[PDB]
Write a protein that binds this DNA or RNA. Structure first.
Lengths: 205, 82, 85, 639
RNA sequence: AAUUGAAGAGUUUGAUCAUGGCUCAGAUUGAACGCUGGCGGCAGGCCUAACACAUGCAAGUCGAACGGUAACAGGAAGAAGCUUGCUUCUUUGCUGACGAGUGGCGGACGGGUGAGUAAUGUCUGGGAAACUGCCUGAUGGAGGGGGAUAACUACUGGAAACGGUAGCUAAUACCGCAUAACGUCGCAAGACCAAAGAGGGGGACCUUCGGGCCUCUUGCCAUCGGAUGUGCCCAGAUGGGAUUAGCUAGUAGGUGGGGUAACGGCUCACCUAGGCGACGAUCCCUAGCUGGUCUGAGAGGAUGACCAGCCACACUGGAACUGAGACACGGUCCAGACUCCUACGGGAGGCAGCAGUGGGGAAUAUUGCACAAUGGGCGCAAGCCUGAUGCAGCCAUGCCGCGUGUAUGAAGAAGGCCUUCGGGUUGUAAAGUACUUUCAGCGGGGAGGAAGGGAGUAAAGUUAAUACCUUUGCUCAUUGACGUUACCCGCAGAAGAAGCACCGGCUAACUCCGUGCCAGCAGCCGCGGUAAUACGGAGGGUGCAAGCGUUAAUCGGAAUUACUGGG
């Protein structure tokens, strides 16, 4: 399921930042960003009309790690939802349990937050959840179990969240590792950089 | 002979019985006159327990139908004074 | 095919002999009534109809008759014997 | 519990397998026909077996005596395809060869008797056909000592006459020399004095495990004297069955036959443990393979059984079963084996009859591979001529008889591919021309083949200087020259090639690397025409062993054989000599040692030395070649 | 709140514009093949041969219907050993119960198949000339007798299968009689028609001591009902072909008789000379129907495999009986084919029931466990039976979820590849370092599917009765195939777990070397006769992920069958 490959190399393929290596350190600039995605990344792409869509779809996937088949289920689930599809697709991907744990600063890179969920550390609403695809409910109170609490690695990872913008739609207790999701995020709050409209066009055909 | 009986459905290892009026010669999953309520033994204590429409059942008791012993226990579980 | 329930076959054989014997003796009493109509003897037709009335209704209780075919013998056949009368 | 399987080494058509059918009457009945003279049941099994006077392959039948199981099978000693009988030695460690009463044991049986020593399991001689005139009641039995080459002695002996004593013996005073070899028995001999013969039966029981000497036996089964009491010794003399049941079960396949009512049944003995019916088990394929059905092979009729005992052997159906496949895994046994020492015993064609019905006969050839494992075949020839690995004369009749019954096809072939390797007679100038005189392609080169010593093979060198030689296009010239070595003008394969290419003018705008490859083949068929043709045939050496007394009769075969004389050296009574004769006539050499040798003949050889050359006419095998590009243009070169 | 929905590109030509086919991007399947492959949950799994079938099993049950006892367990008269009441042990249907046998019910349901079927079928909405065991409402009856037969004995035919004759005996078996009505027939008068008793308990009374009698429960007989189920009638809708245009003689209608539970040429007798057909009759080819599934904006096109309804079929063909219901999967009788048995006189066999075997085919399963649960059959009930059902085992077949690690980590090394040999790329990748342990492995805890039912007790009903019984509270002992479960805790160790296609355009992603229109790729255009970005290999990258491609069927794109929507 997981790509488990060179995560930092994938950022240069998109030319921006997939945050697959947010790191305890801040900005990287050790991989030569943008100019060298690969051996023949010096070439200037023709950038086909089909390419901008596929370049946007793989970009949103790798930031979340969602597989292509599972990702298509989010698009069918978002078409039936009320309102514009453009917001509904990013909202359900924000509804994943591994992502909300990442918003709380629990773990550094997103790959760590997924495995943190996998080892029965997360316990939302007083019930442990292993699956990272879990659909978080409004007004949930996720919190790590006391046996997995403050296990060294978890403590230093929270320091990175202080430099993070920190979502307004959720808040962590910090003094006891107790997060609390509330309202579904607005499109203005999340992202405001990726072109979610491009993704729908790829599944429009 | 018409009779009220559970029809037994749901996912595997997830029983979900369907109380329904049907002649005995019919299959358990076969033809039935009409459904009336449902029984969820694995539901436990929550917002839902075991709905049971006694009003239509009170009509079939006079039609000669023979309630099964499983449905007969549901007539007691729904009680009258309780 | 070997079966523990083969007794239903031999008993149906044992039953059909006694059952047809009652159906055969009754119909011969019925064909006798038709001979009285062709003879033109309206008086003998009334007597033969009386001979069969107790036995033909009796079979209907036994299930040999669906107590509807026997009524037809008490219907159209009665319409013949009295028309000659 | 169980019992070891009895042998059946009826070598030289000893009919000792027909004596096994008498053993089924002794173990009978309580309900059986008792067998009959000729064929006759006796577990005949397949059709057209007893009608031939001998079975096509070794059989098996259920039996018991002395409150013990006594399986056995025979004979496999006919012919001719005796290697198949070598696969039955794995079926049981026992032996019971029937030496002939005429001049001792037959020499062909001595080859199967010497093969029993390699098995490492005990065996015993038996006086088959004792009730007959000319029998060696005191003279021919001594010939079994000279042929056994050991110190085996009979446990009893008599001469008749109507009498057939057996228990009255045996080996008084002098007998017991095998005990002298035992470390314990040799110490009792130092004490002296008379002792009970049962006391020496314990030391003989140790030597019996090493199979140091054949157990005694006498009396023809036809006379019905000693053919039953001697069978009691097989029960005690035979080694006890390795019963266990501790698991895990293990075994290996032994033999199988494609019965018409089968249609398949790969029987195999259980080396250890036991297999429950309708249960999966391990195999050599590395997958699950339950035995859906299995039954013991009773002599009177097949019989099902819910589970085989440990050490038992019984047929069982399966979807697949590779030969010698582990029932475990895995069996842990080791022994020597060979197909009578012959990689190919005179291959013979067998092209099926009919332009289409012959093709279905090819599939029956896969059915010959389901039968005896010592069998092989492949359509290496361009005509797809059959080339079966089976050998022997009478053994071929079973493969031909099988075609008249198991299938509906037949063929007659024997000469095989000629195997010619024609070479050019001398080197001569040649050239493909220049420009467009001319025909495609415009690219050309001047081939200049030259003579070479025999067996040197094909050769070529890039004489042209760069860049006209072409760093890449020049290689097609060699690959195209190889196309002309597939056949000469007479269709014989190219040999002694030496085409040193030289001149090669070519135009660049229209030249292609296939253009040079095409003109290159014409340089080899034109330069081969100046060769005038030179036919040659292989002449591999063929060493053979013959008895010295018959060795003088083998020199007469030399004048008829095309081979020339070669060095050889005697080896005691055995003799041998290093021959070297051509393969076209080498297949007939086997017939010569089967007659002049008197059955002692033996030989072996392998192909070697491409040089040969012989008359007459220089005939060649067509045709070469077709289904290739630009082939019709080579006909224009003839005129 | 409940369909908010319609995309296109390549390729005719030196170039273009239309017309016009092909082909690709989409979703999808009861798929196969090729390569790879750790686990879990939920489904599906013979679409080819309606081909033939070894073996097991798939429908039995009631002693509270009856004669009985063949076994087993108790009791009793009686017996033998001997620790004379400890043991041995013959009799005995006297009890608990139970083979065979009679009789009641089921076997027409459940389960499978799509051969047959273009309408005798089904769907949709109506219709009257019907039937309906079991279940149930209402009103009455339930009186009194006779004669046989299985089992069982004697004898006997036959190898078996399986009987024959002569005798004994019961019933809720059969059969006259008495008795009947709003029932049946008839305009009416009148005529005629049914049965069965058992089980539990008991005060007085009555006992030829078989029991009567009182009472409860259940069964039986008749009528009118109720529901359910089935048959029958019509209209409309429900495949292809006109290179099938005439078809029909019980054929159309009438009349009478017979026939069916019931209408009807449903069938005989006679009479009439009609009937159906271009809004497609007969014939020919094909097909189980439909709710639905897939695709599509919709209209529709394909299909209908699983799930569910009806129908057809049960080796082939045909026929009838038993019964409320069959003109009949695990019934009978017969012809025939195909197998097997024989003592060769004569019988046995029908897996399109679940497994399984051979054969066919590209291709699809275990001769599993349990009636714990539901349902059906029988029984008052307990229980028995159930290849239905509940599961388990097998296969990546499909969907879905998860893991195969995470963070740090530059000398930006070794190796590989590329080069203008300056270097770049592989590459935070690996090693190193710091942590974590899901799932597997291993060792302990452990839900839930279970309601009942049995015993016991109290009370309310019933009743002469504090007895029985019915019903409701209540106590004790309990009922799990799955199942070494779900799930949880604990243990060790980054430990056991990543492949496949593609990289000329369409279509996201490249160089180098080898082979020179050779070898080969290909869905369309088409490449290779040159350091081929289209071959082969390697480097790199992309796509996707326990799957990835290929092939096939179907739809959309295709407004190239346009009804919506073309000439």
């Amino acid at each position: 399921a997981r790509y488990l490959g060179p995560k930092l190399k994938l950022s240069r393929r998109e030319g921006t930042d997939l945050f697959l290596k947010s790191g305890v350190r801040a900005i990287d600039t050790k991989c030569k960003i943008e100019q060298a995605p690969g051996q023949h990344g010096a070439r200037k792409p023709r950038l086909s009309d089909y390419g901008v869509q596929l370049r946007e779809k793989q970009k949103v996937r790798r930031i979340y790690g969602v597989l292509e088949r599972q990702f298509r289920n989010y698009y069918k689930e978002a078409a039936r939802l009320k309102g514009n599809t453009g917001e509904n697709l990013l909202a359900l991907l924000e509804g994943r349990l591994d992502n909300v744990v990442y918003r709380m600063g629990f773990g550094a890179t997103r790959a760590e937050a997924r495995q943190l969920v996998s080892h029965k550390a997360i316990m939302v609403n007083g019930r442990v959840v292993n699956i990272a695809s879990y659909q978080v409910s409004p007004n949930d109170v996720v919190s790590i179990r006391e046996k997995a609490k403050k296990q060294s690695r978890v403590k230093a990872a929270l320091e990175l969240a202080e430099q993070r913008e920190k979502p307004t739609w959720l808040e962590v207790d910090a003094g006891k590792m107790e997060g609390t999701f509330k309202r579904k995020p607005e499109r203005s709050d999340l992202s405001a950089d990726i072109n979610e409209h491009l993704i729908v066009e790829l599944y429009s055909k | 002979m018409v009779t009220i009986r559970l029809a037994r459905h749901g996912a595997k290892k997830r029983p979900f019985y369907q109380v329904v009026v049907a002649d005995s010669r019919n299959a358990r999953n076969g033809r039935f006159i009409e459904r009336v309520g449902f029984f969820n033994p694995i539901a436990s204590e929550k917002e839902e327990g075991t709905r049971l429409d006694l009003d239509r059942i009170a009509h079939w008791v006079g039609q000669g139908a023979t309630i099964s012993d499983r449905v007969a226990a549901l007539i007691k579980e729904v009680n009258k004074a309780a | 095919n070997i079966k523990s329930a083969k007794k239903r076959a031999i008993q149906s054989e044992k039953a059909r002999k006694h059952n047809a014997s009652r159906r055969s003796m009754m119909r011969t009493f019925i064909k006798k009534v038709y001979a009285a109509i062709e003879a033109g003897d309206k008086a003998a037709a009334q007597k033969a109809f009386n001979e069969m009335q107790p036995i033909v209704d009796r079979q209907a209780a036994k299930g040999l008759i669906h107590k509807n075919k026997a009524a037809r013998h008490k219907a159209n056949l009665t319409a013949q014997i009295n028309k000659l009368a | 519990m169980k019992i070891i399987n009895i042998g059946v080494l009826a070598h030289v058509d000893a009919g000792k397998t027909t004596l096994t059918e008498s053993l089924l009457y002794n173990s009978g009945a309580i309900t059986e026909l008792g067998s009959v003279d000729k064929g006759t049941t006796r577990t005949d099994n397949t059709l057209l077996e007893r009608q031939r006077g001998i079975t096509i392959q070794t059989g098996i039948t259920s039996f018991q005596w002395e409150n013990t199981k006594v399986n056995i099978i025979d004979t496999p000693g006919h012919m001719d395809f005796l290697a198949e009988v070598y696969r039955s030695l794995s079926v049981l460690d026992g032996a019971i060869l029937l030496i002939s009463a005429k001049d001792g044991v037959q020499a062909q049986t001595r080859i199967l008797f010497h093969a029993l020593r390699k098995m490492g399991i005990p065996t015993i001689f038996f006086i088959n056909k004792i009730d007959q005139n000319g029998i060696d009641l005191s003279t021919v039995y001594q010939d079994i000592k000279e042929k056994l080459s050991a110190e085996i002695v009979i446990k009893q002996k008599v001469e008749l006459y109507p009498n057939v004593c057996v228990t009255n013996f045996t080996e008084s005073e002098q007998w017991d020399t095998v005990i002298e070899g035992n470390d314990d028995l040799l110490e009792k001999y130092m004490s002296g004095k008379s002792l009970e013969a049962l006391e020496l039966e314990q030391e003989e029981s140790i030597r019996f495990q090493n199979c140091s000497l054949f157990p005694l036996y006498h009396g023809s089964a036809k006379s019905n004297i000693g053919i039953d009491n001697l069978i009691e010794v097989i029960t005690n003399k035979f080694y006890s069955s390795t019963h266990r049941g501790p698991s895990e079960l293990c075994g290996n396949v032994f033999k199988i036959e494609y019965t018409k009512k089968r249609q398949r049944l790969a029987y195999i003995r259980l080396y250890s443990g036991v297999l429950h019916l309708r249960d999966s088990v391990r195999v050599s394929e590395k997958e699950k393979i339950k035995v859906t059905e299995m039954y013991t092979s009773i002599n009177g009729e097949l019989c099902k059984i819910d589970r085989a005992y440990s050490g038992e052997i019984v047929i069982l159906q399966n979807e697949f079963l590779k030969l010698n496949s582990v029932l475990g895994d895995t069996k842990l046994l080791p022994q020597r084996k060979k197909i009578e020492n012959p990689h190919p015993l005179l291959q013979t064609t067998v092209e099926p009859s009919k332009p289409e019905q012959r093709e279905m006969l090819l599939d029956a050839l896969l059915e010959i591979s389901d039968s005896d494992p010592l069998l092989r075949y492949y359509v290496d020839s361009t005509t797809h001529e059959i080339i079966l690995s089976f050998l022997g004369k009478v053994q071929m009749e079973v493969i031909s008889a099988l075609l008249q019954e198991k299938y509906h096809v037949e063929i007659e072939i024997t000469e095989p591919t000629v195997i010619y390797m024609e070479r050019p007679l001398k080197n001569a100038e040649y050239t493909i021309h220049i420009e467009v005189p001319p025909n495609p392609f415009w690219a050309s080169i001047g081939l200049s083949v030259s003579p070479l010593p025999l067996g040197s093979g094909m050769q070529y060198e890039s004489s042209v200087s760069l860049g006209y030689l072409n760093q890449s296009f020049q290689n097609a010239v060699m690959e195209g020259i190889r196309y002309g070595c597939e056949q000469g003008l007479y269709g014989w394969n190219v040999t002694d090639c030496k085409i040193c290419f030289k001149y090669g003018l070519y135009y660049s705008p229209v030249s292609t690397p296939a253009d040079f490859r095409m003109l290159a083949p014409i340089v080899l068929e034109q330069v081969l025409k100046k060769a005038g043709t030179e036919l040659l045939e292989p002449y591999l050496s063929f060493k053979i062993y013959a008895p010295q007394e018959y060795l003088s009769r083998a020199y007469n075969d030399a004048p008829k054989y095309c081979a020339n004389i070669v060095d050889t050296q005697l080896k005691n009574n055995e003799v041998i000599l290093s021959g070297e004769i051509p393969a076209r006539c080498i297949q007939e050499y086997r017939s010569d040692l089967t007659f002049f040798t008197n059955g002692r003949s033996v030989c072996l050889t392998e192909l070697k030395g491409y040089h040969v050359t012989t008359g007459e006419p220089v005939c060649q095998p067509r045709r070469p070649n077709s289904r290739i590009d630009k082939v019709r243009y080579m006909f224009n070169k003839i005129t």
